[PDB]
């Protein structure tokens, strides 16, 4: 009759409390209470609140990276706009089905610059898999003689990652509204990717 | 031999400390020390840290709203893409010349949802001036028979406001780098607005 290891129980309570209160306002005392472990047990596995936040963020993002590399290996041969639309759909569904993780990921803004930099350095290698793929797919595109692969890549990455920032924040704490607006969001995103393709290509 | 009123001295120290530390980590004790006023004087004009943050945010945004309505009344007859590009240029210059205000405005993410909502409710009327203008200018546009005025407005507003979110965060604390990258940013933004216009219109 198995439960979560004490480390995974702690990381799950962390994700919940950090997502609710943010980094600065959350306490390891309430994370421990919520994990049903001794206050001293967090220090044992995690040393400080900062390191707890860091490992919880690495654990969630590693979960997402697996989803992605799954998707990537199956959809690699698609047209890139087609690829992005389908991936965005899949991320939308993931977020509505995992609201606590969604809420937790968006707290990265609130933390002090040294912790956020640390996380972004350590995430760069895995975020570069998607970045590098788009870059490579843009070679198979007829770019408007006014538009560099550089501006295309930049615009596309900003659309992809800004769209995520926007819905995670707009639907923070409101999964049923996200589910309610899902089909409209998906249709909006289709037309917008079509605007980009048209404006960007010959 | 005039100085700032005690209220404006407090609001200036607030803008500086909130922009450096964020809402949660800033103390009114260090704001007061930095304003060179008695710890009890902030309570006198502002009651609590939350209300200090709120009035400082209303004071900076009211300053920006004047700049804008100045610009708007002079550039009203321009083509909307032309209008936006020129406004973005002007905001870029403002941000590099007023980094402390820039840094302070981006802290709105860090604060608890009740304070942020309060600010966004009270800001809505003045943000609707620009919103309503774009809406009206989109009637003078030949939209792609696949693209609603609704998707156009949404995409354009997300570009305008997301672009700002991105550079304020990327150049937070680094005004000389913003000034160094200014001409490249301006050129990037020109082509991107041209991509949107092309993709969005007949």
TrEMBL record, chains A, B:
Domain HTH tetR-type: 4-64
Gene Ontology MF terms: DNA-binding transcription factor activity; transcription cis-regulatory region binding
Keywords, alphabetical: DNA-binding
DNA-binding region range list: 27-46
PROSITE patterns (UniProt xref): HTH_TETR_1, HTH_TETR_2
Keyword DNA-binding in annotation: yes
InterPro entries named in the record: DNA-bd_HTH_TetR-type_CS (IPR023772), Homeodomain-like_sf (IPR009057), HTH-type_TetR-like_transc_reg (IPR050109), HTH_TetR (IPR001647), Tet_transcr_reg_TetR-rel_C_sf (IPR036271), TM_1030-like_C (IPR049488)
Keyword DNA-binding: yes
A Pfam family hit: TetR_N
One of the GO biological process terms: regulation of DNA-templated transcription
Name assigned to this protein: Transcriptional regulator, TetR family
Organism: Thermotoga maritima (strain ATCC 43589 / DSM 3109 / JCM 10099 / NBRC 100826 / MSB8)
């Amino acid at each position: 009759g198995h439960m979560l290891s004490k480390r995974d129980a702690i990381l799950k309570a962390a994700v919940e409390v950090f997502g609710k209160k943010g980094y600065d306002r959350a306490t390891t005392d309430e994370i421990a209470e919520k994990a049903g472990v001794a206050k001293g047990l967090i220090f044992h596995y995690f040393k400080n609140k900062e390191e707890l936040y860091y490992q919880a963020y690495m654990s969630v993002t590693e979960k997402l990276q697996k989803e992605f590399e799954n998707f990537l290996m199956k959809n690699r041969n698609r047209d890139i706009f087609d690829f992005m639309e389908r991936w965005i759909e899949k991320k939308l569904e993931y977020s509505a089905s995992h609201p606590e993780e969604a809420d937790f990921l968006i707290t990265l803004v609130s933390v002090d610059e040294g912790l956020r930099k640390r996380i972004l350095l350590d995430l760069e290698k895995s975020q570069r898999v998607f970045f590098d793929f788009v870059r490579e797919k843009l070679k198979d595109l007829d770019l408007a003689e006014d538009v560099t692969e550089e501006i295309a890549l930049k615009f596309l990455m900003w659309f992809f990652s800004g769209f995520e920032e926007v819905y995670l924040r707009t639907y923070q704490g409101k999964p049923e509204l996200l589910k309610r607006d899902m089909n409209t969001l998906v249709e909006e995103v289709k037309v917008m990717l079509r605007i980009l393709k048209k404006g960007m290509t010959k």
